[PDB]
Design a protein that fits this description.
Oligomer: homotrimer
Number of domains of chain A: 2
Keywords: maltose binding protein, fusion, heparan sulfate biosynthesis, sulfotransferase, Glycoprotein, Golgi apparatus, Membrane, Signal-anchor, Transferase, Transmembrane, Periplasm, Sugar transport, Transport
Chains A, B, C: Maltose-binding periplasmic protein, Heparan sulfate 2-O-sulfotransferase 1
Largest sheet of chain A: 7 strands, mixed
Largest interface: A-B, 50 and 54 residues
PDB class: transport, transferase
Assembly: trimeric
Bound molecules: a molecule of 2 linked components (GLC-GLC)
Entry title: Crystal structure of heparan sulfate 2-O-sulfotransferase from gallus gallus as a maltose binding protein fusion.
């Protein structure tokens, strides 16, 4: 409960919160109002929650980039400083805290990342990134490391990714507004690739975080590091002779760090909006106020003109502004949250090798399109003997880390058709079982249309089918020789020497033409007509459902390409699926132990059947559709497939 | 407003809340904090509401089974007892209050239902249920009754339903989790059936509740009763010589009562989470604390080891544990809420005869699939002369009790096609008119696709059609002889002696082939093409809409089977519809007063028309589809149809 | 935070809030509880917001009409007056504050609009509206005006609109409930038309609001005005000799003002529900309480019997009741909110000429069907050279005032097919970009099915196509002579003298039959089959998507009729589009500078192509469908088209 009468302030732990407390103490001694400063973990995430329920701190401190979302969600109150106060702060800092014309926070300081090197180890810091690998080889030979910085927060990695071309909602002006994100273009790739190489050649270590980097550098174990003004305080204490300079260039271009402005917003639910205003305007935003804070951990270029003129003479601050200017001021639009998450995940995954750079960024471009939700559900009504085991298994292996559930649907005697009441039961489970979302449901069930049931959000359908004949042949020898997944269990007809070709020639049951009729009914659905072997109507309904209801249908013999596309369009589920497939062993699961290729004549015989022609028309339809999707989705280079970067943006947006 | 400084506790009225108050008083005398204990009605339902808005009690008392949902909804705060405290309570009781690894409540006591008989009336209590009918005959002859207990709460009935096979999310373990509900299998039916028979043979009375049972037994009017430890307190006061023993077996199997653990959770919005912890750990969960409570109304087997060793010597407690062990500890997963409602409604309806046991449980299986919502809307765009009056009337008769609305859509001159603007008007009404939900809208309107209008949740469509010719013949004589619904009103052509056959032979207007074109356009929709008599495209669109958009389409001559299926798939609307149809009189409403079967030659003539062929193809398509749904939905036994029990469950769920 | 211990009351600023304060002061002197009365702007809108979050005033004052919605949303607490109190207030006033059987507010006074004239200027006030124009001519010649009243609130205009036939949920009774709105019938039109004429003939001024009317009349500048009892207070101060009489009749019928009852409801979140009850029952609803208030600004006919008997002797109050009785008591059902907004917007737009009366009311009927939401999104995937520029431009010009966004979708090289990953990106943007809603997205993109992506709410699709050949011919000469939109930019083939006919005869590329294949794929979508020139399947999918997914598809040569329909079905977007089209100049944008009609023989040649036949079948299908929609949507009169009024309502609603 936001208590009235006192003030609760939240500020990140890397900042000088102890000094901030002193300003709180001064405030108590002059007004009698107690001021408590706290520094929670995941501050930028805790606030929007604890606050969305009329609770939380009175004043929230954070870079301006996230305040936009807080504003759009009505968690921030509008600040009303009179022009007398507004005039003592730099005009461009007020812009950082302006959302929809209103001022939603008080700016405090300008933060920008700089290169921080060890004078004793590296007399002359490197001007470019390209020269850091050679340097590390020399420094390694002396028991040292060249560079070390937080590879966990995209904040520290972004300067490089953006260097040659990456961006996020470039600041534009005009009668109209524009929307264009750019994390999957050449530049961004060239940048992240360079960083991934640095890890491959062991120049850097993928899981080095803020602390390991700080400790390493502050112990003179590594010549350089990348950090903000707040880090100077601890470096001073380590008697390390350091320097704060411009960031290394990449491809002849400067590193463009996303520049942020530390800001203080007032909680819209705060019953002390006034006391909050008094503290921030008459106490914190004064020379003595900022000094108390800055003495704890440097703020950088304060927004307060009177105190900046002083701090500006600090070489380190000059280095800050130099880098700051080489880059850009972060936007404060709501989209920013999705942007950071997308980029955060891409770097981490690219750095650990879980994803290639192409796959990592293609996914981030997708993930940046909206704030990630848990509301998604995938239904994969697998068709027997189509490599469904291999696939469904990729989901099982990725589900724990990717944070989603996998569930197998088991139907009595493996009947593809559920009763009407069971359909209702199934749909109700899938749409309401919140704890299973996001979820991946798979099973031997023909398509079931969720629309008829009045659901809010339909699930996403995907599938995999293979040539009609080959799947049958596969099911044939399967029943007689088992698989290599669970080799122990002898299948129902183990030890029948009758070959497929033999069965055809002798007109056996398991090789009858009507056994080809399977993939069509699985898509056609739970309709009577669907199960009339050879129905033309069912063949049309099958194609319509495949086109209208299915997200993507791949073919057994092209499983890899299928996974690649899914990893681009549905990263929450298949992020890292390609690498897993390409190097996991569990890639070609449940192979049939013994098989015997059909006869050129045995096939030509099956191909005289109406059932075959139909099931074949269907397969072709689906295959053409997959090849089409792949073709409009990727580009080839040296036999390698790459995900085309986003090819659309919004322009002429009105009003602004 | 959850006031800070004091404590508000909620506990059910059957428990010893007065004794709990004494513990509160002790707490006030040692800390100065006032403690108010209250016992509201529908406690388990009030909490989740009053609490979902940051209000309500500080501490909520209830069996552990519902705390799971409270947890998932963030209404409960995590309890932090140190192992010093955790060790003084039985380990299995802490498991009951564990949800998602966290401890969400303090366990207090173990409750289980036992058979409570009158030593003076029934010296030797019956060992099985099967012997209770004979016993009642003997006891009735002496002015007494054999057994009486609450038939309103499924809690008391469940022991019997579960005896031979019923269950709800059986507790399993392994690398994976499982989900399987079982309230519609043989066992559950055999159990509820037995109970329904006991009411049919007047051994028990369907609307006997907790009070009638307690009063009856405590007045020695009935030899037995089923209740929990809390009931002993009032029995002691009635000078009735009673005994607490094992529950009667059914089919050689023991009654498995759902075992619950009385638990105390702390409100997540409570500003006194600490005072709450102090009260529960140092005051209530102590020998003197539980004793104060237990002296008011027995708690059962307390979770506190030190005090259990004492109470355990009580024969009654031994009987409690005996029954407890014969059964199972209730799960605490969110699904539990839906489970209880489904079972509560099935018993009540089966017991009053509103539903047969099959229909009652088939519906509960459906209703257990998700928490009931009011967001559902059914649109029944009735086709003239297809028994729509009979049907729509079943909705009108069931709507009050089943809690939903029925509304008739009236269109100027009964035009099946609404204007584009009216479609928008209609859709807006149906999707936003919250107070009419759930709702049943019916009227002479052709299919209208809600998808095109950007709605969140589409409505559910159902319909009923009949043979093309017979419906026309029906409409023919209708216009001339009226119906028996409103016999007074003479219809537009009353007193035309021209028979149907006569009209055909003379090529009259009302019997023209083009008048057969009606059921097709009604499904095809509001598209121009639909209304071009004899359009092939319209015949295809009709089938597609029937398959893709309609929940279920029955045929006039099979109205009963149609109702049976709807009562299984949509119980909120049609619960009890079968019984109503089978025995209400208002079953064959609006019959046409006088009719004259067409001529074998008059029909053969209509059947030469393209319009007939098409409309006939449609009817056949729909009929085959209904027969198919019915076939995959029911099983026959002695000419009787039964709803197949659920044939699917989830396995290999990962992670756990 | 609704503070406990005091009382916060909200009342509209036109009422006597200062007098109400005096009652608050009396309450403080007898109980020590401070009472603060405030009068915010947009009170009826502020409450439901500030209150929906457990905050706001303790007591809310407003006419009973909106309290229904407040109730349905649980913002009001039930009032519990004992029959001793209930009996001292008129029974019909308690009905006004009864929602769903419960009493949700205390009634205070009955308000009704009356005609207020200047005795000195207009000795004998006009009995009918029809005689006011002549009167103004006489009064204008003397430097005066005849009538002036608030034309901004539909409250003041409604008496006239309802006079001859307009209504809103007429109060009915019976075993069943009824729902029927009537703002687009003859009467309502006849009424608003009369008012619009008064503005056309400059008898009144469209943007005259409450203040201008009050000032004008109170300065004797205008002979009459329409207002409530609250206005008498200021008129008395202006030494104007005024009289309060019956409202002028229209078409021989009396003006039926919507009668409202000023009511005081208690905030459901209020922690002082008792103090609130004490103040309202023992202080405000007493002779001395109402007198204090009434002395500030007359309340009208108080609900308190004892004090009404006094005030009832006031001629002015008699005039109030006379008008009140000629009209009806406003309903208090939730629908009322939507009703007022719809009517408020129609009057304003009709009065400014932005909409004709027909268009204004047709739209209000549509807008009254549900509370307006911002959640709507329109996607207009424009086809090249179909007048899309003219149309998309109407959106741009109307978006600022109509409060919605317009965005152009730009695809690399104008490719109609997005990649699978881009489709995901696009859909994610459109469904989650909250700040762009409502929105209008337009661009060269073929249909994209949002269903496959598991979205909550699909967007609305509209399009415009034209004859296959003429569009091609248009695209032909476009490339060679440019357009008049951006004449400067010379198009890719500027200065080719080859005519269309010439190109055909010489079998050129840009005039090839396969270039006709465009409108079909645009509707068929992102499927491979769609892009196989001449595919029969694609032609069927195109028709299905046009019928199943598109809201409305118009044809280039009938753009006006298309706009008219959209202005009726989607007023939020196209309100005023017709007038803009009919009189804006920017109506036929981007015309091709030079063209040359094809040859009767050149056409007959193209018409031999399979591609033409197909694309032609499609166009015809779409054209027939548009003509059909228009036909069932409008009526013609003197060559003029009018939107048919709503032709459906709900009857036999059960239960009541
Ligand atoms: O990298 C993601 C993260 O970057 C920024 O956070 C910075 C912050 O601005 C600095 O003041 C300092 O605290 O380092 C942080 C990185 O760990 C964005 O401000 C933040 O929104 C974003 O999630
Ligand atoms: O029967 C439905 C109901 O059963 C249980 O409630 C029990 C409770 O556990 C006992 O302590 C005692 O109060 O009798 C109640 C039955 O009236 C479940 O705990 C409850 O959730 C469920 O709705
Ligand atoms: O015209 C729309 C508006 O009308 C009514 O508001 C009246 C109110 O009832 C009177 O007491 C006085 O304040 O004039 C108002 C008109 O400006 C409805 O009560 C209100 O809900 C509606 O929006």
């Amino acid at each position: 409960k936001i208590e009235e009468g006192k003030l609760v302030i939240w500020i990140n732990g890397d900042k000088g919160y102890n000094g901030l407390a002193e300003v709180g103490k001064k405030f108590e001694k002059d007004t009698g109002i107690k001021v408590t400063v706290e520094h929670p973990d995941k501050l930028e995430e805790k606030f929007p929650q604890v606050a969305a329920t009329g609770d939380g701190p009175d004043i929230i401190f954070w870079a301006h980039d996230r305040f936009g979302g807080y504003a759009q969600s009505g968690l921030l109150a509008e600040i009303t400083p009179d022009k007398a106060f507004q005039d003592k702060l730099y005009p461009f800092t007020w812009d950082a805290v302006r959302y929809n014309g209103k001022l939603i926070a008080y700016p405090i300081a300008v933060e920008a990342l700089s290169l921080i090197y060890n004078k004793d180890l590296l007399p002359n810091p490197p001007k470019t990134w390209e020269e850091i690998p050679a340097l590390d080889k020399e420094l390694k030979a002396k028991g040292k490391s060249a560079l070390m910085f937080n590879l966990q927060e995209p904040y520290f990695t972004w300067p490089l990714i953006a260097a040659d071309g990456g961006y996020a909602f470039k600041y534009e002006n005009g009668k109209y507004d524009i929307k264009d994100v750019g994390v999957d273009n050449a530049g961004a790739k060239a940048g992240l690739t360079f960083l991934v190489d640095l890890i491959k050649n062991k120049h850097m270590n993928a899981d080095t975080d803020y602390s390991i980097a700080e400790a390493a550098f502050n112990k003179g174990e590594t010549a350089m590091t990348i950090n903000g003004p707040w880090a100077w305080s601890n470096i001073d204490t380590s008697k390390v002779n350091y320097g704060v300079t411009v960031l290394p260039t990449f491809k002849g271009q400067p590193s463009k760090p996303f520049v942020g402005v530390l800001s203080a917003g007032i909680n819209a639910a705060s019953p002390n909006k006034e006391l909050a205003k008094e503290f921030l305007e008459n106490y914190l935003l004064t020379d003595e106020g900022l000094e108390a804070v800055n003495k704890d951990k440097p703020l950088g270029a304060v927004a307060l003109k009177s105190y900046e003129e002083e701090l500006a003479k600090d070489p380190r601050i000059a280095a800050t502004m130099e880098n700051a200017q080489k880059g850009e001021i972060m936007p404060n639009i709501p989209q920013m949250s999705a942007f950071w998450y997308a980029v955060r995940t891409a770097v981490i995954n690219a750095a650990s090798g879980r994803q290639t750079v192409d796959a990592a960024l293609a996914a981030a471009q997708t993930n940046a399109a909206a704030d990630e939700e848990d509301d998604v559900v995938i239904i994969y009504n697998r068709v027997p003997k189509t490599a469904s085991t291999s696939f469904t298994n990729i989901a099982y292996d990725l589900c724990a880390k990717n944070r989603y559930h996998v569930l197998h649907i088991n139907t009595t005697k493996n009947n593809p058709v559920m009763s009407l009441q069971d359909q209702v039961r199934f749909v109700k489970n899938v749409t309401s079982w919140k704890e299973m979302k996001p979820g991946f449901y798979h099973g031997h069930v023909s398509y079931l249309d969720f629309a008829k049931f009045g659901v809010k959000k339909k699930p996403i359908y995907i599938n995999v089918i293979r040539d009609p004949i080959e799947r049958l042949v596969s099911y044939y020898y399967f029943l007689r020789f088992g698989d290599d997944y669970r080799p122990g269990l002898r299948r129902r007809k183990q030890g029948d020497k009758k070959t497929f070709d033999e069965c055809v020639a002798a007109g056996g049951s398991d090789c009858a033409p009507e056994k080809l009729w399977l993939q069509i009914p699985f898509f056609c659905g739970h309709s009577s007509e669907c199960w009339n072997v050879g129905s033309r109507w069912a063949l049309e309904q099958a194609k319509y459902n495949l086109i209208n209801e299915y997200f993507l249908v791949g073919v057994t013999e092209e499983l890899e390409d299928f996974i690649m596309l899914l990893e681009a369009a549905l990263p929450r589920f298949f992020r890292g699926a390609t690498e897993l497939y390409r190097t996991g062993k569990k890639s070609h699961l449940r192979k049939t132990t013994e098989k015997k290729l059909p006869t050129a004549a045995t096939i030509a015989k099956l191909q005289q059947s109406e059932i075959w022609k139909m099931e074949n028309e269907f397969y072709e339809f689906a295959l053409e559709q997959f090849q089409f999707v792949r073709a409009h989705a990727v580009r080839e280079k040296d036999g390698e497939l790459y995900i085309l970067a986003q090819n659309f943006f919004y322009e002429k947006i009105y009003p602004k």
